[PDB]
Structure formats: C-alpha cells, structure tokens
Amino acid sequence: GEELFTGVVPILIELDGDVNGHCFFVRGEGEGDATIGKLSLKFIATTGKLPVPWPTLVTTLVQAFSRYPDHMKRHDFFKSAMPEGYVQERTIYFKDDGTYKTRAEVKFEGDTLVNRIELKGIDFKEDGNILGHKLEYNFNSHKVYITADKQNNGIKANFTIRHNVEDGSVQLADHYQQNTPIGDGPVDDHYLSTQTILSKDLNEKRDHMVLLEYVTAAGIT
Amino acid sequence: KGEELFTGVVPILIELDGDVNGHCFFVRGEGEGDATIGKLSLKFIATTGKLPVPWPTLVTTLVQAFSRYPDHMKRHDFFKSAMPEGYVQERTIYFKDDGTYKTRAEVKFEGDTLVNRIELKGIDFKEDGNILGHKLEYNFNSHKVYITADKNNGIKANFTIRHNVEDGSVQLADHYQQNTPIGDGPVDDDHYLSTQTILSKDLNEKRDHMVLLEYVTAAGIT
Ligand SMILES: [Mg+2]
Numbered sequence: 001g002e003e004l005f006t007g008v009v010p011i012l013i014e015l016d017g018d019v020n021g022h023c024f025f026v027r028g029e030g031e032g033d034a035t036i037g038k039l040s041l042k043f044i045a046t047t048g049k050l051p052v053p054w055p056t057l058v059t060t061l062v063q064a065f066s067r068y069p070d071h072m073k074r075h076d077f078f079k080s081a082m083p084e085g086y087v088q089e090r091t092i093y094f095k096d097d098g099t100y101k102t103r104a105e106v107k108f109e110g111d112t113l114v115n116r117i118e119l120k121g122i123d124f125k126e127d128g129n130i131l132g133h134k135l136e137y138n139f140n141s142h143k144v145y146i147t148a149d150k151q152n153n154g155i156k157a158n159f160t161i162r163h164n165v166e167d168g169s170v171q172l173a174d175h176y177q178q179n180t181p182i183g184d185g186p187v188d189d190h191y192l193s194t195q196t197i198l199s200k201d202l203n204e205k206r207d208h209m210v211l212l213e214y215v216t217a218a219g220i221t
Numbered sequence: 222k223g224e225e226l227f228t229g230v231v232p233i234l235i236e237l238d239g240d241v242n243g244h245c246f247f248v249r250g251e252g253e254g255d256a257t258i259g260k261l262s263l264k265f266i267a268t269t270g271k272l273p274v275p276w277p278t279l280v281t282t283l284v285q286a287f288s289r290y291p292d293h294m295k296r297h298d299f300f301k302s303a304m305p306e307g308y309v310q311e312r313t314i315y316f317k318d319d320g321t322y323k324t325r326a327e328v329k330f331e332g333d334t335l336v337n338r339i340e341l342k343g344i345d346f347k348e349d350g351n352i353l354g355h356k357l358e359y360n361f362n363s364h365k366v367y368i369t370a371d372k373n374n375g376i377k378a379n380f381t382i383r384h385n386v387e388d389g390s391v392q393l394a395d396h397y398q399q400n401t402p403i404g405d406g407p408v409d410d411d412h413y414l415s416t417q418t419i420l421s422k423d424l425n426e427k428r429d430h431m432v433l434l435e436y437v438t439a440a441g442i443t
Binding site for chain 2: 018020021022023047
C-alpha cells in the first residue's frame with residue numbers, strides 16, 4: 001500500500017454530525033505528504049456556524065499520512081489497507097461533559113483519498129466548555145498509542161486529548177479507537193507523535209479552520 | 222397486559238428528532254395520560270432552540286393508546302392490545318402545495334412510563350410557504366381518525382389535518398398511517414377516533430415550547 005502514498009496525495013473530508021440535537025456539516029480539501037508526514041487542509045461549515053468548537057473535531061476529521069520510519073514501514077496499517085481502505089470508529093469522552101461517537105470510511109476515490117464521517121454527540125452540558133465555546137483556538141501535541149487487534153484483524157488506539165480552555169486548566173477528551181480492513185487481508189505496539197496548527201483564511205466569511213499537521217511514528221528501536 | 226396497564230393515570234415521555242429541509246431540531250415532552258377518560262396533558266420543549274417549523278405541524282407526530290374506547294368497543298382498539306411491548310407507528314404527511322413529513326416512532330412502556338420515541342424527516346418544503354414561513358395559527362381543530370385493519374398484522378389510518386392559517390385560509394396535511402405490533406398477539410373493525418386539542422403556553426418558560434391538552438374518544442360502531 002506504500003506505493004499509493006508516493007508524492008503528494010489529494011484529500012477530501014466529509015463529516016455529518018449531531019450534537020445535543022444540533023445538526024451540521026463540514027467540508028475540507030487539501031493534500032497530504034505521507035513521505036513527509038505533512039497535511040494541509042481548509043475546512044468550511046456548509047450549514048453556517050458550528051455549534052461546537054473546532055478543536056474538538058480535529059481528531060475526528062486521517063492517519064495514512066503519517067511518516068513511518070524506514071525500520072517501521074511494515075507497521076503502518078493505515079497505508080497497508082489502501083486503496084480498499086479501512087473503517088475508523090471512536091467514542092470520545094469529555095471529562096465531566098458529553099461524549100462523541102464516530103464512524104468513518106477512509107479509501108481512495110480515483111486518485112483522491114476521501115474520509116467520510118458520521119458523529120453523534122450526546123449529554124453535553126449547557127454553558128460547558130464545549131457547547132459554551134470556551135476552548136482556545138489551538139491544539140497540543142499528543143501520543144497516539146497503537147496496538148494490534150487480532151480479533152477484528154485491525155488495530156486499537158487509546159489516548160487523552162488536551163483542549164486548552166480560555167482560562168488556565170484544560171478539558172480532557174479520552175479517545176478509544178478501532179480500525180478494520182474493508183477487503184482482502186493485508187495488514188507491534190508503538191505510538192504516533194502529533195503536532196497541529198489551527199489558523200484563519202482572512203477572505204473566507206464562512207466559519208473556517210485552516211489546518212497544518214505533522215505526524216511521525218516511533219516506539220520501536 | 223394490555224388494557225389493565227391503562228387503568229387510571231399513566232406518566233408520559235415523548236422524544237422527537239427531526240430534519241426539515243436540512244434544519245434538524247429535537248423536542249422533549251413530559252406529562253400524563255388518563256386513557257379511561259381519553260385525556261392527555263403534556264408540555265413539549267425544543268431543546269435545540271427555536272423551532273424551524275410551526276408547533277401545530279408536530280402535534281400528530283407527538284400516544285393514541287390513551288384514546289377512550291367505549292365499553293362496547295373494548296375489543297376494537299389495537300393500541301392498548303400491543304402494550305406493554307408496544308407498537309411501531311409510521312406516517313407520511315403531505316402538506317398540500319408544500320413539503321412532506323416522514324415519521325417513525327416506537328410506543329411502549331418503560332417502567333410505569335409510556336414512552337413515544339420519534340424520527341421525523343421533512344422534504345420539499347417551500348421557502349416563504351405556510352410551514353417554513355411560520356404562517357400557521359397556534360391552535361388545532363377537531364378531527365376524525367379513520368382506522369382500518371391491515372391484516373402486516375396491524376392497522377392503517379387515513380385523515381386530513383386542517384391547520385388554520387393567519388390569513389384565514391387553511392393548510393391541509395394528509396396523514397397516511399401504519400402501525401405494527403412490536404411483539405405477539407394483538408387485536409385488529411372500521412371505526413374512527415374523535416379528537417380535540419388545546420394549545421397553550423407556560424408564562425414562565427423562555428424556551429420554545431407547547432402545552433397541550435387533548436381529548437380523544439372512539440366511535441363508528443353502534
Ligand atoms: Mg437529530
């Protein structure tokens with residue numbers, strides 16, 4: 001699957017959501033450089049104003065795009081499942097607040113890699129950090145601990161995301177993940193190091209998130 | 222159990238999830254029903270803010286098991302016979318010269334509370350129409366609900382709702398209904414339900430809401 005990631009690969013992102021009854025849609029376009037672990041994307045809300053903070057959707061809207069080191073090439077499930085693709089599911093627990101359930105498909109559509117997502121948010125508190133938009137427009141660096149999931153012939157990941165709040169302490173989001181192959185069966189413990197930058201397109205009147213991310217793999221000597 | 226469950230007053234919880242021309246919203250209602258007297262008292266609230274559609278259009282979509290069937294009609298009602306397991310209630314509502322509603326609901330007992338859970342999708346509603354334009358008066362007329370057996374082992378119903386418009390004209394809503402029992406062994410003749418509704422507001426409620434009082438009795442058989 002490594003052969004399809006050579007050079008620059010186009011990216012398409014689609015998300016459908018419902019948070020405490022609030023529907024919304026997001027569309028993103030950009031490109032990815034798996035060889036260099038670089039992502040550049042621009043997101044727009046096609047339904048108006050986003051009812052939840054943009055940082056909370058960062059993890060939900062890819063991962064093939066990670067640069068796995070030469071001695072770790074065989075451990076990249078994300079790239080190995082292409083072009084057929086894989087299904088990615090999560091339950092995100094915001095401490096003392098609501099929860100997100102997500103289901104996505106990542107696959108090639110022509111020469112474009114597409115990520116179509118469905119998320120449902122429930123039990124979010126009124127005037128909370130999420131529904132109250134009290135989260136800073138930024139993102140911290142994290143470690144995505146990946147482990148094999150023999151039963152589903154895929155992988156599982158666990159990590160806690162730290163969302164900066166406008167005053168000083170931070171809002172935690174526990175992430176639980178499962179990735180499963182879509183077709184024919186081509187596949188150790190390790191982790192991903194992530195860095196993200198959120199920004200704004202000054203000539204865009206629509207709600208915008210501009211994204212730059214750098215991801216590498218490690219954990220094996 | 223299935224009629225024995227409705228002696229006296231039963232608590233009610235109602236939940237609706239909807240999408241009209243892309244505008245999702247949710248409504249939650251709580252109240253009580255006294256099937257012996259065919260009476261309902263409920264309060265509904267929009268938990269997502271302002272309703273993108275007029276409240277009266279959601280009345281029929283929001284517990285016919287509380288209808289009052291006469292002693293000589295005990296056999297006839299199917300609503301209570303399907304309890305406590307409950308029944309599925311589906312509808313397609315066509316508003317004349319406007320959009321359409323598709324609904325799916327499950328009505329059943331959860332403990333001592335009768336619960337009605339709903340999904341509603343509205344399509345092809347016109348901009349500046351009576352519906353999306355909020356031109357319907359805050360009231361509800363009396364109707365007759367025509368029920369017939371669907372020996373899907375349930376029932377079907379057809380009727381036309383009359384919504385008063387602010388200008389004085391009326392917006393019609395054709396209702397097509399299908400009910401199927403969730404589990405086993407329920408009762409199935411042609412007859413109708415006579416309905417009366419009263420809409421009001423809670424003076425101390427800032428959220429978009431609707432207070433409803435309803436009286437339903439059955440007839441059509443001598
Ligand atoms: Mg909904």
